[PDB]
């Protein structure tokens, strides 16, 4: 089987199709949103609250004895956190709470958090209710739909999935915040826990997002520039102040002598500039302190951490602070070696042997989804809650009054209002500076298509840092291959900053269950506990930017690690990175990389030997035929472009991609012939025109009370097929109808990108839409302040037009509301009208009346009007190729050119549109669909005569011209695509042959 032929291409392409459809069966398309929110609820919520023990020193007074410091210093600490499923907390048997209740009643679909606090303040250091505090209300957190907390997920398909809150098209990765549908956008951050090499002052850097006391080593600063000084290394600012030279921090950590610190760095030898730099470093070192003499003669110069600091890092500023550098390292004999490694990296970057860190290369980037953002916001508002609480505990010095420890001091409304303003306002906390705000986060959720929701749920965003040489921050970088999309993007204020996650892209979540001990079983000798210098030229194995060991012959070691991962013995979300030049191995167990699956070229190919008729995706990840691969790991892999012929030409490949059209986004991958069009046209189609086309809306329109719902009558699917539309099996990814298009000059009405339809086709229902708009009002509870009562009524004294209103204040359910009437009777008892009225351009038949309310009685009213529109002489349409127009002339049927079968076109466009705009994909699509839908003669004998029919216009793997033209020759038509017509006015033969054939067109919103 080592040839890998004899199980050839119809087997392998079938396997790729089955694997891709099983992929979408297991994961779906909103998988990352749900995984990050679920991870937050399962682990990170309890992980946030473990902060401290809440001491309280109560500094008020000391003149007298009865106001000494004799009242007890308190103590209290958090325990478990318990989160309910969301309920509607009414008295008299509280009720279960659903997202459609939240939308129609204008409330927040939120759940209650209860914390198991313990308090054991007890008078024994003067010169208890750990129990009865099991359930303390601490804020209300909102709940994602389809989460592990939403009540619409416990039943799979037909137990009770039909509840009253569902659509068959909805998959639900959104929120509901006071009646509105919110959605996070994925942010983009730098990958910390990695060394970062600048070059303007040469300042190699050990970042840490937590532990805001962490340092950089800078070599390109001389402190003066008079004649010139040699570049010497100063370990610059270390505790947000306090520069030190490098050698004081060597002999503070207990280096024995020199020539081991030169072997700790261990540069090339020679390259005078390096050794001149280090001897200048020593000569700068002894000029500021006489070091290396005692255990305190060098360590005593680490002295600026005491007073010359401006910010003394805690109490006991001594060797206790030596667990503020490098906490992942455990003793000083490794911290000295890691300092030597940092300096070796800096010296290797100076001589042009290691390239500096390119920021816009996406292996240096971690994407923050909803979990980390909720982490950040909740930490901010919890810290404010802790301060507000401890200021409240201190007001009861030396006299109790109200001492019940809980429910008198811990206010839930603080965290409640905080998390509400975070979603509603957009005032999102900055990831670095803990006082300011950022904005380009949670937005609204579009509903015009069911494709606009998919596009709106899969987006990632680079922020604007400063417009002085952003660099390549809006241009596709070769690390986007297979992960983000390199064709579709917005244009305008944020062109290229908001990027679309691809089809087969996935986002890693976290890896728990620590794996330091798991690496020993393939190599991985352990790191020593002394300088000495026994370290050879053996390779280095880092774990999240941390020395945990050293191995040799790594070409076998990473092979064995990948072999343990493919046998489901190491976790699946772990990248194995073998850097052969820098002599280094990196292992990632990180939260927020970008993963995608690939075919592993096995040497046995179990698919031949077994052949079941089913393949679950959990099953194919056990046999190691597929494999989740990140960006780091992929550049060590030579991957073919498909089983088509390309994995059969050679065997120099170690992987294969499933199919090449999965490089694109969710909306760009379904466009026929998409690599034939100019890139600007595909950007148009896949960012704006697909998001605007009129088509499917929902499968339960009785509950969606929103402004301007729209829908066609007869939606369709295209005649052709693409790969992604077949593996997804959503016909809601196509919103338009299969028009027949002929390119010909009309009388002058289709000039300047204008189109001409057929009136007979318009009268049989084609492109007939239907819109529904909703009108809303509100009034206080019933009688309370918690006259200006504008209670919904009639007010019979004939203010405006009241021909259709009933006594309740609202019309009836069959009315024919006119150009300008009264639509809601919101009038008071005696004063003038506050009633809502129609403006100049809204009218239509009443569909339903919905009357809901809020907790404080705030009664809500909803009236929906319905209209039916046929497309008028000012409306806009478009093809699948960014070729849009305006309907300018509606023509009667018997004047069109007709073929010998009597076929008439439905849309006629101008042939001056094609040689300039460079879209031959529309002509190829028309010829393909015309070759599909026609019959096939000579069917008697020798064949079933309908089996060699091409229906696949997959983008990067498309049928040739000879296939299409020989299909049109088989179907009976002319090979050039044309067709002879006769005129509808003179009736004789038009001299020029006309190009006809079906095309999927679209109808766009903002009609006029």
Partner 1 sequence: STMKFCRECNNILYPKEDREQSILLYACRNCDHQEAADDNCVYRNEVHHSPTLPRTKAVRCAKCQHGEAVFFQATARGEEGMTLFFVCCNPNCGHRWRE
Partner 2 sequence: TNDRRVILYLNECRCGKKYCQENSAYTVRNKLKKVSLKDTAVEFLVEYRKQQAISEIFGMDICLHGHIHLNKTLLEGWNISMQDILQRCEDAINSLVQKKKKKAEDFKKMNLSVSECCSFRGPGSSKDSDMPCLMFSSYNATDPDLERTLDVLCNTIYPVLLETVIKGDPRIASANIIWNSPETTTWIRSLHAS
Partner 3 sequence: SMRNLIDIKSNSAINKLVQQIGFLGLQLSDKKKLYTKTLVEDMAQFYKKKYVSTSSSGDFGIVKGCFFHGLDPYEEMAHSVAAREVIVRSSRGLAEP
Asked if residue 648 lies in contact with residue 454, where contact means CB atoms within 8 angstroms, the answer is no
In the chain, how many H helices and how many E strands? Answer: 23, 44
Q: Measured from the CB atom, is 429 or 656 closer to partner 3?
A: 656
Position 466 contacts partner 2 (CB under 8 A): no
Smallest distance from the beta carbon of 649 to partner 3, in angstroms? 8
Smallest distance from the beta carbon of 878 to partner 3, in angstroms? 19
DSSP symbols for 293-308: SSTTTTGGGTTTTTST
Q: Which does 227 bind (CB under 5 to 8 A by kind): partner 2, partner 3, partner 1, none?
A: partner 2
Q: Which does 286 bind (CB under 5 to 8 A by kind): partner 1, partner 2, partner 3, none?
A: partner 1
Binders in 208-267 for partner 1, by CB under 8 A: 256-260, 262
Q: Measured from the CB atom, is 3 or 227 closer to partner 2?
A: 227
Asked if residue 824 lies in contact with residue 792, where contact means CB atoms within 8 angstroms, the answer is yes
Q: Which does 273 bind (CB under 5 to 8 A by kind): partner 2, partner 1, partner 3, none?
A: partner 1
Position 227 contacts partner 2 (CB under 8 A): yes
Q: Which of 279, 516, 873, 933 binds partner 1 (CB under 8 A)?
A: 279
Position 911 contacts partner 3 (CB under 8 A): yes
Smallest distance from the beta carbon of 248 to partner 2, in angstroms? 21
The piece of 270-278, 526-534, 619-627, 678-686 that touches partner 3 (CB under 8 A) is: 678-686
**3-state SS, residue 555:** helix
Give per-residue burial for 162-182: e unless 16+ CB within 10 Å, then b.
eeebbeebbbbbbbbbbbbbb
Position 196 contacts partner 3 (CB under 8 A): no
Nearest CA to 544 out of 610, 590, 484 is that of 590
Element (H, E) at 36: helix 31-39
Position 272 contacts partner 1 (CB under 8 A): yes
Smallest distance from the beta carbon of 325 to partner 2, in angstroms? 33
Nearest CA to 233 out of 250, 255, 252 is that of 250
Q: Measured from the CB atom, is 256 or 873 closer to partner 1?
A: 256
Tokens coding 415? 């965290």
DSSP symbols for 145-186: TTSSS-TTSSS-SSSSTTSSS--SS-----EEETTEEEE--E
Strands 860-869 and 998-1003: unpaired
With CB under 8 A, what is the number of residues at the site for partner 2? 4
Nearest CA to 136 out of 389, 478, 514 is that of 389
The piece of 21-29, 191-199, 275-283, 387-395 that touches partner 1 (CB under 8 A) is: 275-283
Position 495 contacts partner 3 (CB under 8 A): yes
Q: Measured from the CB atom, is 279 or 306 closer to partner 1?
A: 279
Smallest distance from the beta carbon of 587 to partner 3, in angstroms? 24
Q: Measured from the CB atom, is 146 or 681 closer to partner 3?
A: 681
Element (H, E) at 378: helix 370-393
Tokens coding 924? 């190829």
| Cα–Cα dist 486/683, whole Å | 10
Asked if residue 453 lies in contact with residue 695, where contact means CB atoms within 8 angstroms, the answer is no
Position 475 contacts partner 3 (CB under 8 A): yes
Position 286 contacts partner 1 (CB under 8 A): yes
Tell me the Ramachandran region of residue 533: left when phi exceeds 0, alpha when psi lies from -120 to 50, beta otherwise.
left
| Cα–Cα dist 454/595, whole Å | 19
Smallest distance from the beta carbon of 367 to partner 3, in angstroms? 21
Tokens coding 729? 């099996």
Smallest distance from the beta carbon of 251 to partner 1, in angstroms? 11
| Cα–Cα dist 927/922, whole Å | 9
Binders in 270-289 for partner 2, by CB under 8 A: 270, 272
Asked if residue 86 lies in contact with residue 109, where contact means CB atoms within 8 angstroms, the answer is yes
Smallest distance from the beta carbon of 583 to partner 2, in angstroms? 24
Strands 506-507 and 539-543: unpaired
Q: Which of 537, 961, 985, 987 binds partner 3 (CB under 8 A)?
A: 961
DSSP symbols for 691-718: HHB-----S-TTT---S-EEEESS----
Position 228 contacts partner 2 (CB under 8 A): yes
Burial of 380 (0-12, 13-18, 19+ CB in 10 A): middle
Smallest distance from the beta carbon of 579 to partner 1, in angstroms? 25
Q: Which does 257 bind (CB under 5 to 8 A by kind): partner 1, partner 2, partner 3, none?
A: partner 1
Smallest distance from the beta carbon of 284 to partner 1, in angstroms? 13
Q: Which does 874 bind (CB under 5 to 8 A by kind): partner 3, partner 1, partner 2, none?
A: none
Q: Which does 276 bind (CB under 5 to 8 A by kind): partner 3, partner 2, partner 1, none?
A: partner 1
Q: How many CB atoms lie within 10 A of CB 927?
A: 22
Smallest distance from the beta carbon of 309 to partner 1, in angstroms? 31
Phi, psi for 196 (deg, rounded to 5): -125, 125
Q: Which does 986 bind (CB under 5 to 8 A by kind): partner 3, partner 2, partner 1, none?
A: none
Tokens coding 449? 């298509």
* CA angle at 155 for the pair 614 and 370, rounded to the nearest 5°: 90
Position 842 contacts partner 1 (CB under 8 A): no
Position 678 contacts partner 3 (CB under 8 A): yes
Q: Which of 231, 376, 386, 477 binds partner 3 (CB under 8 A)?
A: 477
* CA angle at 810 for the pair 805 and 816, rounded to the nearest 5°: 55
Element (H, E) at 393: helix 370-393
Q: Which does 196 bind (CB under 5 to 8 A by kind): partner 3, partner 1, partner 2, none?
A: none
Q: Measured from the CB atom, is 130 or 275 closer to partner 1?
A: 275
Smallest distance from the beta carbon of 262 to partner 1, in angstroms? 7
Position 644 contacts partner 3 (CB under 8 A): no
Binders in 738-757 for partner 2, by CB under 8 A: none
| Cα–Cα dist 896/740, whole Å | 13
Position 956 contacts partner 3 (CB under 8 A): yes
Position 981 contacts partner 3 (CB under 8 A): no
| Cα–Cα dist 565/389, whole Å | 49
Q: Which of 273, 552, 816, 943 binds partner 1 (CB under 8 A)?
A: 273
Instruction: Name the site residues for partner 2 (rule: CB under 8 A).
Output: 227-228, 270, 272
Per CB under 8 A, residues contacting partner 1 are: 256-260, 262, 269, 272-273, 275-276, 279, 282, 286, 292
Q: Which residues here bind partner 3, judged by CB under 8 A?
A: 358, 361, 471-472, 474-478, 481, 486-487, 489, 491-492, 495-496, 638, 640-641, 646, 652, 660, 663, 673, 675-680, 683, 911-912, 915-916, 918, 920, 956, 958, 961
């Amino acid at each position: 089987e080592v040839d890998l032929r004899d199980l050839g291409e119809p087997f392998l392409q079938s396997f790729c199709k089955k694997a891709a459809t099983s992929f979408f069966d297991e994961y779906g398309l909103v998988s990352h949103q749900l995984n990050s929110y679920n991870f937050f609820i399962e682990h990170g919520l309890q992980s946030v609250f473990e902060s401290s023990g809440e001491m309280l020193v109560e500094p008020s007074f000391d003149p007298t004895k009865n106001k000494d410091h004799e009242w007890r210093y308190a103590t209290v600490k958090f325990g478990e956190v318990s989160v309910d499923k969301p309920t509607l907390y009414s008295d008299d048997k509280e009720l279960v709470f659903l997202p459609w209740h939240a939308r129609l009643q204008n409330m927040t679909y939120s759940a209650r958090m209860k914390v198991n606090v313990d308090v054991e303040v007890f008078v024994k250091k003067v010169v208890i209710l750990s129990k009865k505090t099991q359930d303390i209300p601490i804020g209300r957190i909102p709940v994602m739909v389809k989460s592990v907390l939403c009540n619409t997920t416990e039943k799979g398909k037909n137990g009770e999935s039909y509840r009253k809150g569902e659509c068959a098209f909805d998959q639900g990765g959104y929120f509901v915040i006071k009646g509105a549908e919110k959605v996070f956008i994925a942010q983009e951050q730098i990958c910390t826990k990695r060394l970062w090499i600048s070059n303007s002052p040469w300042t190699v850097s050990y970042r840490s997002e937590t532990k805001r006391n962490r340092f950089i080593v800078r070599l390109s600063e001389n402190q003066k520039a008079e004649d010139f000084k040699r570049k010497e290394k100063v370990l610059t600012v270390y505790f947000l102040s306090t520069e030190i030279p490098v050698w004081v921090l060597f002999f503070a950590l207990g280096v024995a002598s020199d020539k081991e610190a030169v072997d700790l760095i261990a540069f090339d030898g020679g390259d005078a500039s390096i050794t001149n730099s280090v001897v200048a470093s020593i000569q700068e070192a002894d000029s500021v302190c006489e070091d290396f003499r005692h255990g305190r003669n060098a360590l005593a110069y680490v002295e600026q951490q005491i007073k010359g600091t401006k910010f003394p890092p805690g109490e006991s500023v001594d060797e206790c602070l030596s667990l503020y550098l490098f906490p992942g390292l455990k003793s000083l004999t490794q911290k000295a070696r890691f300092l030597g490694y940092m300096v070796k990296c800096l010296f290797s970057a100076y001589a042009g042997k290691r390239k500096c860190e390119n920021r816009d290369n996406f292996r240096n980037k971690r994407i923050e989804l909803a979990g980390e953002l909720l982490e950040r916001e909740l930490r901010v508002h919890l810290a404010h809650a802790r301060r507000t609480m401890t200021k409240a505990m201190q007001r009861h010095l030396t006299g109790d009054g109200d001492l019940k420890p809980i429910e008198h001091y811990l206010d839930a409304s603080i965290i409640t209002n905080g998390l509400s303003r975070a979603f509603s306002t957009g005032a999102w906390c900055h990831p670095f500076r803990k006082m300011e705000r950022v904005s380009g986060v949670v937005a609204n959720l579009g509903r015009a298509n069911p494709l606009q929701s998919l596009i709106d749920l899969r987006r990632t965003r680079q922020q604007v840092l400063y417009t002085g040489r952003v660099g390549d921050a809006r241009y596709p970088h070769p690390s986007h291959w297979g992960r983000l999309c390199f064709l579709s993007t917005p244009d305008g204020e944020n062109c290229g900053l908001v990027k679309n996650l691809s089809l087969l892209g996935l986002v890693s979540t976290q890896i728990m269950e620590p794996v330091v001990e798991e690496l020993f079983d393939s190599g991985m000798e352990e790191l020593m506990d002394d300088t000495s210098t026994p370290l050879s030229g053996k390779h280095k194995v880092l774990l999240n930017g941390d020395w945990v060991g050293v191995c040799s012959d790594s070409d076998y070691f990473v092979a064995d690690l990948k072999s343990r991962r493919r046998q489901s013995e190491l976790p699946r979300q772990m990248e194995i990175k073998l850097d052969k030049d820098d002599k280094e191995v990196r292992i990632f167990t990180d939260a927020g990389r970008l993963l995608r699956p690939l075919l592993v070229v096995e040497n046995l190919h179990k698919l031949k030997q077994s052949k079941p008729s089913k393949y679950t995706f959990e099953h194919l990840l056990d046999q190691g035929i597929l494999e989740l691969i990140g960006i780091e790991e992929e550049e060590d892999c030579t991957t073919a472009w498909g089983t088509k012929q390309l994995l059969k030409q050679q065997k120099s490949y170690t992987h294969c991609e499933l199919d090449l059209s999965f490089l694109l986004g969710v909306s760009c991958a379904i466009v026929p012939f998409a690599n034939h069009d100019h890139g600007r046209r595909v950007l148009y189609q896949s960012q704006k025109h697909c998001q605007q086309a009129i088509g499917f809306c929902s499968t339960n329109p009785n509950i969606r009370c929103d402004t301007l719902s729209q829908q066609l009558f007869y939606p369709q699917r295209p005649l052709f097929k693409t790969m992604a539309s077949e593996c997804l099996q959503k016909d809601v990814l196509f919103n338009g109808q299969n028009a027949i298009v002929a390119v010909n000059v009309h009388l002058g009405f289709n000039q300047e990108d204008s189109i001409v339809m057929n009136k007979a086709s318009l009268e049989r229902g084609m492109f007939r839409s239907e819109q529904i708009r909703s009108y809303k009002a509100d009034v206080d509870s019933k009688d309370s302040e918690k006259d200006e009562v504008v209670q919904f009524g009639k007010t019979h004294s004939k203010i405006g037009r009241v021909d259709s209103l009933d006594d309740d204040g609202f019309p009836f359910v069959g009315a024919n509301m006119h150009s300008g009437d009264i639509v809601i009777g919101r009038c008071t008892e005696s004063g003038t009208d506050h009633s809502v009225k129609l403006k100049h351009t809204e009218r239509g038949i009443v569909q339903k009346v919905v009357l809901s309310s809020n907790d404080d009685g705030k009664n809500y009213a909803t009236v929906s009007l319905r209209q039916v529109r046929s497309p008028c002489l000012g409306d806009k349409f478009s093809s699948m190729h960014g070729q849009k127009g305006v309907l300018g002339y509606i023509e009667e049927q018997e004047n069109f050119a007709f073929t010998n079968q009597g076929i008439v076109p439905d849309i006629v466009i101008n042939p001056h549109a094609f040689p300039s705009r460079q879209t031959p994909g529309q002509l190829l699509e028309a010829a393909l669909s015309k070759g599909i839908a026609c019959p096939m003669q000579k069917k008697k004998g020798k064949s079933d005569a309908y089996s060699k029919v091409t229906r696949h216009a997959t983008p990067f793997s498309t049928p040739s011209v000879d296939d299409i033209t020989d299909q049109l020759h088989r179907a009976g038509f002319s090979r050039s695509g044309n067709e002879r017509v006769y005129n509808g006015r003179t009736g004789e033969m038009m001299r020029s042959l006309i190009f006809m054939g079906p095309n999927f067109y679209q109808r766009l919103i903002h009609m006029s």
